[PDB]
Amino acid sequence: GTTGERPFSDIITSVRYWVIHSITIPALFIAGWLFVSTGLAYDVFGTPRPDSYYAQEQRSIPLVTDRFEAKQQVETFLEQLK
Amino acid sequence: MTILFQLALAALVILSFVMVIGVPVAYASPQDWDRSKQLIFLGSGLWIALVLVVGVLNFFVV
Amino acid sequence: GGRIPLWIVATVAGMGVIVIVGLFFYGAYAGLGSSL
Amino acid sequence: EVIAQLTMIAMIGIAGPMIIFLLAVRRGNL
Amino acid sequence: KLPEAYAIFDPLVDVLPVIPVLFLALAFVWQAAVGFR
Amino acid sequence: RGWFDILDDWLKRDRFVFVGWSGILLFPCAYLALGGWLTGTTFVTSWYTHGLASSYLEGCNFLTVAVSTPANSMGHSLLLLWGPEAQGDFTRWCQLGGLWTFIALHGAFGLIGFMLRQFEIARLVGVRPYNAIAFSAPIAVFVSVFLIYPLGQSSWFFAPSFGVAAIFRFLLFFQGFHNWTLNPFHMMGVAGVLGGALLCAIHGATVENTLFQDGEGASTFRAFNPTQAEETYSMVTANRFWSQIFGIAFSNKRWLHFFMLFVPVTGLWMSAIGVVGLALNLRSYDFISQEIRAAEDPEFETFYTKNLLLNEGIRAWMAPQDQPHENFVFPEEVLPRGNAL
Amino acid sequence: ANLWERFCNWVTSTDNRLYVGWFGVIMIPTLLAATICFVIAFIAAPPVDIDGIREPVSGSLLYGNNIITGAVVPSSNAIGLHFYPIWEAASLDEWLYNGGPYQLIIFHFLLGASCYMGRQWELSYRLGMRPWICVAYSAPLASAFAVFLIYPIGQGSFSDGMPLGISGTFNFMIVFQAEHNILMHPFHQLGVAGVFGGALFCAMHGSLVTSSLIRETTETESANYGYKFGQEEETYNIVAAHGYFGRLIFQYASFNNSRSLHFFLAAWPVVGVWFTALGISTMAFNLNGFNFNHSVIDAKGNVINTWADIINRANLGMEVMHERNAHNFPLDLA
Amino acid sequence: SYPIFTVRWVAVHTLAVPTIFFLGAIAAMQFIQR
Amino acid sequence: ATNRDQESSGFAWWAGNARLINLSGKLLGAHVAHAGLIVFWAGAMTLFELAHFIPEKPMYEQGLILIPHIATLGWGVGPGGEVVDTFPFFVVGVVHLISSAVLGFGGVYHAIRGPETLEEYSSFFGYDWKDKNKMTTILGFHLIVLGIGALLLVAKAMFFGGLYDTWAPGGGDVRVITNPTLDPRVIFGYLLKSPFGGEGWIVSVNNLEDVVGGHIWIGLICIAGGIWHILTTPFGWARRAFIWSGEAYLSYSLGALSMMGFIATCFVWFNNTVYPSEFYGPTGPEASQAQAMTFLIRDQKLGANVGSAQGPTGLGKYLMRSPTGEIIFGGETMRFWDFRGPWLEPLRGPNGLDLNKIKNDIQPWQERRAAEYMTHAPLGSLNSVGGVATEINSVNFVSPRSWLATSHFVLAFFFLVGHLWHAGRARAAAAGFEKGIDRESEPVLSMPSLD
Ligand code: CLA
Ligand code: CLA
Ligand code: CLA
Ligand code: CLA
Ligand SMILES: CCCCCCCCCCCCCCCCCC(=O)OC[C@H](CO[C@@H]1O[C@H](CO)[C@H](O)[C@H](O)[C@H]1O)OC(=O)CCCCCCCCCCCCCCCCC
Ligand SMILES: CC1=C(/C=C/C(C)=C/C=C/C(C)=C/C=C/C=C(C)/C=C/C=C(C)/C=C/C2=C(C)CCCC2(C)C)C(C)(C)CCC1
Ligand SMILES: CC1=C(/C=C/C(C)=C/C=C/C(C)=C/C=C/C=C(C)/C=C/C=C(C)/C=C/C2=C(C)CCCC2(C)C)C(C)(C)CCC1
Ligand SMILES: CC1=C(/C=C/C(C)=C/C=C/C(C)=C/C=C/C=C(C)/C=C/C=C(C)/C=C/C2=C(C)CCCC2(C)C)C(C)(C)CCC1
Ligand code: OEX
Ligand SMILES: [Cl-]
Ligand SMILES: [Cl-]
Ligand SMILES: [Fe+2]
Structure with missing residues (x-):
């Protein structure tokens, strides 16, 4: 039988459905795009840009080696790139 | 004659693209069968002509 | 309420995934991750 | 260039669905 | 390379080989149109 | 009618997607394991914990992205967003591995919720709960591999990371360090999994090729009505065929479908046990008698000794990069190598 | 009638306890040869020079193996793809040293198992069945052809065929990973999906049909006695099984047509194992798994390792140690 | 006479809208240069 | 709707080409239209390869599989396999592409506009699958066509410039073949070589005189057998041995093509004579x-x-x-x-x-x-990193010998399955139980118990 909701086949063919979603789907796509292109996603998540994996002349990875001084080790590593 | 070959060749491309769409549409619409059994006829011969034309010209450019 | 025929929404939807995925395979050869 | 290649294949790619489209409009023999 | 006469068609020539797989996809567009009867 | 009973009514309403009481636990935790994995494979690095790129943002593709394990120096920390290590700082939480524990722990509870849901729906519809029972084997596997195994080791670092190639590395680590192929508990698990694939295929094919002709068309799918009383294929002809092809054959449809449950469920349980052992480095690594012979007899060689040499290559060639916190420095001259290569 | 027709009706008799069939005329002698040779070699064969370097590998129980380490060892690299029947050896002693039993066993075996598949077709025809069980068997059969025949062809030696042993199988897998990165290969990923999903769907289907057995017995007896062999009615409520499984996910993720359901169970493992057999068969021609070694570099061009690079480090340990005495030149090209 | 906002509505939107957002993000990543 | 739906045809949409089994005209259209697709690809692909071709690089560093087939026939190539003229590659390319358009036109005409069945338009072009006479006649005509093509290769080797001969003194060069091998002890000696190591069955052919000689035999043999089948009808032992139906004939050809696919796989992997390493690596x-x-x-x-x-x-x-x-x-x-x-x-x-x-x-x-x-x-990765599996990125290379072997093993395997599929079905269908077991006369119920 039918649990009562509106058939999907019916909604995706309706014009109201595509009136609403002609704007919302690209709007979300463009937001996601801007999340990355503005550079915001590097800074929310702490992900290195291609210039900030290593100091210019260093060849060693900023590996955190202490549990409770951990947040502090990462902050020191990042300042050492300036 | 350079630009004359490139005209003959894009003539061929355009006519193929038209023929690619209209031959199957024409064939499966019988309402206008006789309407069109000369259009594909004349298209076909036109098409063949350009191939021959582009084939001879090739030698005065390539 | 049915106005737009399903096969057309399928073809369009389909072509839309092809583009996005194609783009990802392009990106495998360009920019980050491309070995170059 | 790549816009050249892509506009070619955009046009070739729509050529198929178009046939289908025009034959369903003109109530053809699909 | 193609001969220089035909060079303008390089972008068209680059994409022609994919066309037979469009026929395969076109059959499915076609069946969706007649609803897979 | 109390407030508990009214709530109960709404939770168990027949809707497109059943909620239930189990849903309160299932839907938040599943959505958040899922969500967290997508978020981290899309946006998060493994640079500070592993020295690795691991996100699309960084140039990884679907095969190489991962939500990697926390650094070994975190021990078995819960790595709470508000705990001593991140101190409420979301960005530094991500850089320290918190999405790994985030995903692992919400995944544990989402799995609980899914089994509870299996129980819940079985009770309401009126069927025996054998599907819930069968789902115990995947829970056994998730718990043994993702939780128990790291808890016996030095830290969560050595658990599997959530990505395709990351899991492949786990496979190769388990060969090189544990000789896991030699383990009878993994061998039973292979038997159970390969045997379940076998039973899947042979059962489906057998039914499909002993159908009765219950319609007139060439597509035989349309000649089945789920309300029909009658068996759709011939047990009798299927039994004869296999008796004469293979010597034995099922004769009891109930036994047959219980066996189908039994085989893979049992396989996965057995492999779970083997991994609990490996939590402790309690391996089936060696055969002492072969080692005593080989050490004395330089002309004695088997596939068992050949494979230990491969293990020895894996450990030494992969350890420095794979366990970076150890600071392994192996000069060229100590790396084990055969001739030329 | 005459003796030939008498023989023909016996061969294709449907009243034989094991069906013989024309395929069985070939299958029985080849399977017997291969089985007798394999059992004797696994117990008693002396050490075999698999890699052609005068370094015999002991595979048999009497020469110091157990059940897990024992094997019948592949024939020598010196032989490559040459055919080495017993009668080409100058003595059985020679034949044993150079791995002759492996060739005898696998050829008789591939031949017999091909006829096993044909014989599946044959009996289905004599019984009036649909014919495609043998097509399901082609997936394991193809897999065997890959590790015993195709991979040696592509690599130029039966010495790189899979050993006939438990530990020999592992050796073959580890060496394959090093030389081909099979784990990074999508046909093997499809193989895993095929067998994981097959085990899933096996357990699922068994659990769902078992969850919906109709009460036909008391609590003190096996519910298996609620089914009588050849009974006309079904012994479970497929509508109940659908109603549980539709609610567990949602209604349309669930099958209510048994035929479609059972065809999905056949098709899912068979296809995946087709693909993984094809992976062995194309890696036999060195079209190997994806290579992302140093694919990520930073603004300077430092290599930023990924998990693929860590896999490569384990691959490399496999590569440099396997067949540690067999390479004189820097590249291992087969 | 159907609802529009249902439990199902929430289900398909809690997946769908994040998915499109994420894709636009990933699309943009293919143009990042080192 | 003439068939074209499940109720009239008995076949569902995912099996819809089985609706054409007794529509010779629409069927003809599908075959010609599909021949158009094959000729199209040989056309577009050669031109693609040519656009991407750089004559100073070895062919096998550039991903080319069709230009090496043309180079091997003597066109475009000089001593050492150097490319001296690319015009012939252009021609080969353009002519197939143009021809696909007329195969295309003729296929689409027959499949859509044409008569659906041919047998009332003309007793020559129309056929019943069970007419053994007609079927061996058609078989005969295609045998003739095939023998002719085998002799076009001879024509090219002996009269029209020759063939590329990797073995030619001087490091390889195009060479006219004047003394092809006719001695049947050589030609059919190849057929009786063991397929094992050091022998190689027919993959071992290592000189152009044997190649050209064998195509003289095959051409003559195909033309004679064409004529045989035109004038004969199957004998009684052959009539009793085979199933006579459309699906069965399909299944015999899938077996054959499978067999041929596997041999081609090994030809390209082992033979460096008709697949010269100058071109294929x-x-x-x-x-x-x-x-x-x-x-x-x-x-x-x-x-x-x-x-x-x-x-x-x-x-x-x-x-x-x-x-x-x-x-x-x-x-x-x-x-x-x-x-x-x-x-x-x-x-x-x-x-x-x-x-x-x-x-x-x-x-x-x-x-x-x-x-x-x-x-x-020929070692490399799926994304075309060249070398062993542990090599680093840098070299962008996979041997066309790898590409051609792998692809044709996959195709040959799946055509063997197709053989088994349709062969088992054709037998079931001819006996009349392909749609399941008749509940009112189930065969096993009339057999004695096994024990
Ligand atoms: C596309 C190719 C093709 C096909 C499909 C056929 C098909 C057929 N032929 Mg024709 N034939 C062909 C080419 C072909 N032929 C050519 C080129 C010639 C000229 C030589 C002939 C000459 C010919 C004759 C003389 C006869 C046929 C007959 C037949 C029919 C029975 C075939 C049969 O039993 O299979 C083959 C099945 C067998 C059981 C034969 C034995 C096969 C054994 C097991 C294998 C080993 C021997 C094998 C013959 C070749 C050895 C190759 C080895 C060295 C590698 C069938 C309609 C028969 C008929 O009915 O005539 C009207 C018949 O008597 N054919
Ligand atoms: C079913 C829902 C559910 C469940 C089981 C979990 C479970 C968890 N989450 Mg997740 N979480 C959820 C929903 C849920 N979360 C939602 C909806 C979000 C979005 C906001 C998040 C966001 C989130 C984040 C951001 C993080 C977690 C984390 C955690 C972990 C630690 C939680 C903790 O310490 O709780 C502490 C709180 C309690 C245990 C609640 C106590 C309940 C009462 C007050 C106790 C006292 C009772 C009282 C005396 C008697 C009353 C009787 C009654 C009759 C009234 C744990 C695995 C952490 C994690 O994974 O880090 C590794 C983490 O960082 N969660
Ligand atoms: C090589 C591919 C191939 C070919 C050649 C065919 C050919 C055919 N099919 Mg099969 N089919 C295929 C693939 C193919 N099919 C696949 C993959 C599927 C599964 C999705 C099917 C499913 C299927 C079903 C379910 C049915 C067929 C049917 C048919 C026949 C008639 C179809 C009809 O009425 O068209 C009607 C369609 C149209 C009029 C729309 C336009 C189609 C034209 C041909 C497009 C041509 C465009 C092209 C660019 C040409 C222009 C270039 C110009 C220069 C020449 C026809 C002979 C039917 C049949 O058997 O008839 C009884 C049928 O019922 N097929
Ligand atoms: C093997 C393929 C094949 C077959 C068997 C048929 C068979 C048929 N077609 Mg089709 N047809 C085909 C291909 C095929 N056609 C192609 C490719 C096209 C497009 C050019 C057409 C276009 C077409 C149309 C437009 C019509 C037909 C018609 C017919 C019917 C009568 C034709 C006749 O008597 O010719 C007479 C034969 C000759 C005069 C002999 C000379 C033919 C040429 C010049 C010889 C070429 C030989 C060449 C060297 C072969 C190799 C080609 C290539 C591989 C290099 C018949 C049922 C007619 C029909 O059904 O009536 C309604 C019709 O109206 N066909
Ligand atoms: C229906 C029931 C039927 C089932 C019957 C079961 C079959 C039983 C299996 C027996 C198969 C082994 C018999 C081999 C005889 C050995 C002869 C010999 O001298 O080698 C015996 C030894 C074997 O090798 C030596 O084995 C010894 C153990 O006894 C020692 O360990 C030696 O170290 C070891 O090298 O080698 C030789 O003597 C060299 C002989 C070479 C030339 C003689 C030609 C022999 C022809 C061999 C053909 C055998 C093919 C078997 C086919 C039988 C099929 C029914
Ligand atoms: C050579 C040449 C030419 C020609 C061309 C042609 C030949 C074309 C064709 C074309 C075509 C041939 C195309 C087609 C296309 C197609 C498509 C585009 C489709 C797609 C599909 C889809 C997308 C699908 C979807 C779906 C459906 C529908 C249903 C089911 C589900 C799905 C989702 C799958 C020209 C003129 C240019 C000129 C130059 C040269
Ligand atoms: C039936 C059918 C079908 C099928 C179809 C087909 C298969 C078809 C084919 C078709 C074809 C097969 C077509 C073809 C066409 C082509 C063309 C159209 C060509 C043209 C060419 C040109 C135009 C060229 C030009 C040039 C030159 C000369 C030089 C260089 C450059 C260029 C390239 C520009 C389908 C499935 C869909 C559906 C159902 C029905
Ligand atoms: C060209 C060439 C050559 C030559 C070639 C030749 C001369 C060929 C031959 C070929 C041949 C001449 C083939 C044959 C084949 C055959 C077959 C493949 C057969 C089959 C059969 C069957 C299939 C049968 C079946 C059956 C039986 C047995 C019983 C009853 C049933 C039936 C009928 C089913 C050479 C190498 C010098 C070089 C390169 C080029
Ligand atoms: O043998 Mn068995 O394994 Ca195929 O690679 Mn080369 O060779 Mn030996 O090294 Mn690595
Ligand atoms: Cl080894
Ligand atoms: Cl070497
Ligand atoms: Fe079942």
């Missing part, structure tokens, strides 16, 4: 041998006596004996000693590699070919 065996040659040369240059250099195992580091005593390259390449190639054979003596010729007669062009071939071994 070295064979697996060839690259491996070329590596041993390379380091023999290097070490010999440094002062090593390579004939007496005992390696770690006690076997020669550079040279050893095959199991029949031939001198061969040592190391793992021992397995590949059956290899034979123009760059190597000058070092061959009656007992195998000749140590005097190794010490004295290696030319720089052999050193050159051996290094080129070792560094283009």
